[PDB]
Symmetry: C3
Subunit: 334 residues, 3 copies
């Protein structure tokens, strides 16, 4: 596996974590994630230094994660704080790796690379997720594809015309206007779908519609899905700001953190349902089926030297793909 290890990744949603550890692998590194009694999240290598047991299968004793096998206890910095055996000696060899963690924007960010290099200032901005003016619903899915396939999926939101046709079809697709903005470690794909009638989902939300997506390295995206009367200014539109963040698990699997942060109907539980239903149907079923299928075709494509043929809808995805490749090969030396 080539991964970009010197980057922050979402390892969990905060609501996933408790005093009961969660075991999750990121970039082929198994983690034990838990919240301490003072509310601070810890991320330890999920391999007890004694005999390699899953720390994530243990419990907290006085706020310290206890290995379920022979009961070594660790603090959130990975220091061994109790050895119930023999003289109770705690040599430095009993300490476990602890990863840099930042809880921000209702996300748990972890740095799996060179710890000397982990700068929290580099975490991308998902502030809408903790803005009182926005209502945020979402969750987690696991996907049996390489993460870059789901980056591709998201950076060309045109696929929704077909993959998600029951919800997302529109006749104005004819008249799609595209636009890509490239910035420093950030790329945006803009689509405008003018004048058309609303898709099934937008009608639940003659109109203009905007589906924009912003990528920041490595694989963190925030989209902007908006619909409004024809003629209505984009900035006056009701919108969902969509969290779509990917984290590699293995070379051929990933973690998908998704969310809708909406500026409309924010006390409306029927709207909560519309959006959770979309997430359930579109993201965790329909897209999964596509990208998992493509993953299965990788061996053939690679064995036969097949390269993708690009269409007019592919600029932003291609630019993002090249940026990740650039980061991946940069790190591979050294």
């Amino acid at each position: 596996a080539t991964f970009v290890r010197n980057a922050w990744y979402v390892a969990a949603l905060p609501e996933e974590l408790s005093e009961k550890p969660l075991g999750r692998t990121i970039l082929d590194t198994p983690l034990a994630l838990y919240r301490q009694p003072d509310g601070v999240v810890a991320a330890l290598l999920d391999i007890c230094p004694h005999r390699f047991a899953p720390l994530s299968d243990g419990i907290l004793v006085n706020g310290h994660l206890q290995c379920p096998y022979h009961g070594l206890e660790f603090d959130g910095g990975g220091q061994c704080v109790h050895n119930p055996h023999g003289n109770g000696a705690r040599p430095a060899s009993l300490n476990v790796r602890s990863f840099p963690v930042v809880e921000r924007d209702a996300l748990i960010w972890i740095w799996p690379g060179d710890p000397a290099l982990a700068d929290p200032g580099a975490i991308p901005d998902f502030g809408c997720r903790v803005d009182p003016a926005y209502r945020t619903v979402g969750g987690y899915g696991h996907v049996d594809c390489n993460y870059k396939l789901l980056v591709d999926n998201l950076m060309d939101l045109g696929h929704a015309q077909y993959v998600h046709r029951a919800n997302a079809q529109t006749d104005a697709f004819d008249r799609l206007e595209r636009e890509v903005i490239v910035g420093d470690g950030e790329i945006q794909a803009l689509m405008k779908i003018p004048g058309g009638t609303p898709s099934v989902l937008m009608a639940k939300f003659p109109v203009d519609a905007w589906n924009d997506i912003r990528w920041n390295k490595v694989s963190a995206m925030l989209n902007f899905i908006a619909v409004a009367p024809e003629g209505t200014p984009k900035e006056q539109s009701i919108h969902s700001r969509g969290t779509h963040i990917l984290t590699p698990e293995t070379e051929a699997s990933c973690h998908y953190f998704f969310g809708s942060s909406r500026n409309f109907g924010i006390d409306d539980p029927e709207m909560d349902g519309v959006l959770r239903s979309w997430q359930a149907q579109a993201l965790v079923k329909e897209d999964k089926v596509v990208v998992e299928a493509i993953e299965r075709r990788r061996a053939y494509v690679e064995a036969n030297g097949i390269r993708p043929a690009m269409l007019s809808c592919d600029e932003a995805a291609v630019r993002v793909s090249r940026e990740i490749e650039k980061l991946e090969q940069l790190e591979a030396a050294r």
Copy 2:
């Protein structure tokens, strides 16, 4: 995986196909197989040229297969016939590979190699499957073995005496007469079982008659892995040409190096309008082929790792000539093609 690509293989039974595509892998090549609205079967590489989505998950739009991801449309020759995006241009890079198909003898034959070389004259003769004088029943099985193991299985039909003993055991097995005939592209293993009580199955062929019979179990192989047997039984001394018989379709197609597709059938000249005989034959196929032979050859496949790691080679018996000759011919074909 080494396969012989310049050869016809059965990809499907016609009854498996419709306007809803079937995704099936042959010789490590994923295919989308469907019958167009005009009735003609198409076989496309199951990898969209754009971003590699399974066309087999798509549906027909105007009788063209539509990619389910971003909606490119293809015809049965693989030519992109609509691009929904931008100026809608369709350069040659958007065409997908199409595979030659011949629908013949109630089989779907496909050429997985160089399509310029696909010669319908080379398709083996299974005409009995479409001869109104024969009644044909059969179906499909998937097996977790290298196809060559089932070729071995079939080219020694003597295995039926043990593997299928409840149905096939004969008390005249020890009087078996064998011949092997070697032709151009073709090998036959002939077995006559003279003078025995009919097997449980043969007695059913004969509507219970339990007096002594002669029986024949012959098999013809054509390259690469298409076999047709002759299972026949008659009152002792009656000519073989006068017998009631089933001509058995036994055709294998590699899927991966360690798995294959098994297309089987019986084309019989007796009890032609008889649904209970249909059931006897389908039952045999379900028990003998899809269960009992599966169990043997899948177990053998699981032992391949050990055999190879330990330098173990098979020990041949008098029953093996035809199977060995076939194996050596498939080996020859593989080697010819490995150039390059």
Copy 3:
């Protein structure tokens, strides 16, 4: 795979075997295990010499195992004794490998390695299992981990470790002891909890209680059979049991002592060891080594003796 092949391993409990063969893989070697009409167990390579079918899917014909595929028949020595085909000649090429096998102490021992070196005198002493002074029960389980992890766990659980050649004993006596819950009712006590390891992965423990001053030989006690046999690199067979001198006629006690979770491996510990196996790749890729604790003294000694045996065999 790195196994120590030159040693006796348990392949089955006698009660598992009959004239219907059992197919079981030990040290990545597929075996057909069965009893002949005279009761004597044979252990054949589960690969027919003809075309490699599972002999273990066959039946006896006149006391000889018949291949299910084309009917070759073998004796317990692996000699082909009938060929149905043609002239029926039986060249030596048709013989199947037969493994040294000894039924002793209500265990079926097999030697998977160089057969020249198999000496039945070297088979570990589990005589308590057939001593009528003891009530013996047990059973079988499978675990998806490397057998060494289970040997480690067993060799853990006035202290004393005795290291000799292909045997290690870990002794513990607890004066002022506590009876186990199991033994408490058959009684100011001494307690004992000892374990004996013999190469490669065969263990016998000694769990005991008596009034202080009593010879441990005269205590209330159980001798526990705990024998691991590698299946693949990442999986193992675990033969467990106990030979006890208390409650010998109590069938309820027989039942709890036949329990895999009660006697060999509770679910929570199986979860742990199977999880450890899943971490092996990471540990190996990152050159991570275990950090030992005071409880590891015996396990480490055993571990080092196993590693020595492996190295010897890397011929």
